[PDB]
Design a protein around this ligand. Structure first.
Ligand SMILES: Cn1cc(-c2cccc(N3CCCC3=O)c2)c2ccccc2c1=O
Ligand SMILES: Cn1cc(-c2cccc(N3CCCC3=O)c2)c2ccccc2c1=O
Ligand SMILES: [Cl-]
Lengths: 108, 111
């Protein structure tokens, strides 16, 4: 559905980006820059808001469910790599909460 | 009453179908950290959550909104991801359940 894909692009992604905690998720985790020796090894499918945004712009997704899967991968990647109480985890959870709320207002 | 309809859906459809999934069994009761010999689980997982706790809260009309129940579901999953490691079987198992959760959430009656 291009309608749901449009909502994910114009509402969900925009609103997550506006959130004050979005900045660490705004581009791929650059494991060389951040000195994370194991990240590319154990996180099999890195994902971020900018990749999702480019894919929606390029009409890469066929259904909204594939775009939603990328959002969930971005969040679970962060939980899987990090530890409870980490600040990055606290930011991801606030973003996931917002994501979960805006999905509840998805049309169709 | 719109919250009630969505909570009925969460109870009778989403929770039921996750429970039916072959990978649901480790999530059907709270993680028993004593039984499982997990010395740090209760220390670092601040709000443990499981399918039986959610089932009981739905049966006891504990939630006021569907969003509060959805929060417990997400807590169940992120707890698992946060405590465990990428590639763990329990993580693969939660990811399958989480995918089903999002699929059934997509058919939630907009009320
Ligand atoms: C989602 N996420 C994000 C960051 C993270 C923090 C600060 C900065 C950046 N930036 C900025 C541009 C490129 C870049 O990588 C990423 C991170 C750092 C250490 C461990 C885990 C994570 C993580 O899981
Ligand atoms: C969600 N989850 C579940 C289990 C897990 C596996 C097998 C059995 C049980 N059971 C059965 C009855 C009580 C009980 O605790 C829990 C687990 C084990 C080790 C580390 C993490 C986890 C985890 O994160
Ligand atoms: Cl209501």
């Amino acid at each position: 559905s291009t309608n749901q894909l449009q909502y994910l692009q114009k509402v969900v992604l925009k609103d997550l980006w506006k959130h004050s905690f979005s900045w660490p998720f705004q581009r791929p985790v650059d494991a060389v820059k951040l000195q994370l020796p194991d990240y590319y090894t154990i996180i099999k499918n890195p994902m971020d808001l900018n990749t999702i945004k480019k894919r929606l712009e390029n009409k890469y997704y066929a259904k909204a469910s594939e775009c939603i899967e990328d959002f969930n991968t971005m969040f679970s990647n962060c939980y899987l790599y990090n530890k409870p109480g980490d600040d990055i985890v606290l930011m991801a959870q606030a973003l996931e909460k917002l994501f979960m709320q805006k999905l509840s207002q998805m049309p169709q």
